[PDB]
Amino acid sequence: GPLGSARRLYVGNIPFGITEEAMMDFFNAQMRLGGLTQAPGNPVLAVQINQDKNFAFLEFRSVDETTQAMAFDGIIFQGQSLKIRRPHDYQPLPGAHKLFIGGLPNYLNDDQVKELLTSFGPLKAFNLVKDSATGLSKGYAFCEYVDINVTDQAIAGLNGMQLGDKKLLVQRAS
Template identity: 45%
Template sequence: MLQNVFPTDATQVNPLGSFPFLPVQAMSQQATRHARRVYVGGLPPLANEQTISAFFSRVMIAVGGNSAGPGDAVVNVYINHEKKFAFVEMRTVEEASNAMALDGVVFEGVSVRIRRPTDYNPSLAAALGPGHPSPHLNLAAAGLMPGATGDAEDQDRIFIGGLPYLFTEVQIKELLESFGPLRRFEVVKDRDTGNSKGYGFCTYQNPLDTDMACASLNGLKMGDKTLTVRRATSSSGQVKSEQECILAQARQHIAMQKMAFEASGMTIPGTEIGPVVTAEIPTKVLCLTEVITPQELFDDVEYGEILEDMKEEGQKFGDLIDVVIPRPEPDQKMVDGFGKVFLEYSDTIGCTKAKAALGGRKFGGNTAVAIFYPEDKYYKKDYAS
């Protein structure tokens, strides 16, 4: 862990007594930390705390992102070498927001991803400082262009094939936007007739939505056609597992039926929901089973690693509020929900994406089971159901 490189007074003289007290700035450090940190993913193999700190401090000066005066913007770095990501803590909330504009910057030959950490709370952060980068940053000094992602966008460009001619561009776009806002979208058309050729391309504003959309839509039957959805730069399409197809099918079929009804007042052949597949009512809480073993929960180190891994995985699908993994009491007494993992999201959209992606995935040789969990029971800490 890189220690705080800025000297600060740990104490001040209290005129009302002989006991030292923390200055206001120091007392607020913990409260503002969630808004002063940024997540940096896709780090190069040889990156360490010192090189990360030096690089981002140098780049922040170059682009004019420092708001707290002279000195290094970075005060702390926590790096996970195995997962190739780090949390970089800035001096101020404004500097952290400015650092968000550095997404895609090349560090030691690698284009890194910059995101907000999972504990970032937008509503609380709004009162602490600017939530968006300054529009006056000189991003060209870091090899970046405002509003462009360069090679990174090409890597996240999605090919959508097998588009049925029944649906309009607006309806196809609506389907794609169920996984996140789009940066670009186009349906390729015949130059002479202006009719759709049955395929198109799109790019999401958040690259984390790319894999989710590919996994959920690839292989989906729409009428008499089957969608092919994969990264445009991939030589072979990403194939969904059978379990993921089954779990995602109900939600996708319902969406297709709704769109068909709105478009023409009639159902589309092949999209009817059979008696085997039923749709759950989405909630904001996802319950996972068969993803951890009881032995892992007794060890503090393993428990901490599992908790961090689930946070990292869960944030890929939406605004993750909390991760709860019930574990035994110190006296080895079992607790309700032992062996389960609960992911709490800010909305049902993120929770639904997580359910489609995590249900059926292999964890340590076991196939994960994902269900929507009643919010009232979750908030009461009733994990037994």
């Protein structure tokens, strides 16, 4: 981004032979029947198809409607479960999905704590808070996953779970 790609969605696994027009009517219709539309008129302004690789990019009129349409991820359209994602170029703003990791054993080093988190997917940021005078760990860390949907799954996979004699706390750092 940082602000680029705000009003477009990738749509994967589109039906064979489908038209930009039918795609448009379909997503326009869903936005309306789902009550995700936030004003009179069509939220999707345009649809670009790559017939060869079977995906499309939707172009929305507004920022929030782009986000809401993500709730259609999975929707079946002519027998086909659509894969709806953000454009590759789209980034959330830094520390939007920053995580707190509490209840880590204090003898474990950076790489060793990273291991637990890297399990769920790659990180764009991480820091295990230490006592700088000694170098010894305080038992808590912060991180951010590169893919951003990974954030919730790491919480579900770690929050409240057991790690030694301690119980891990994983949550949005705000």
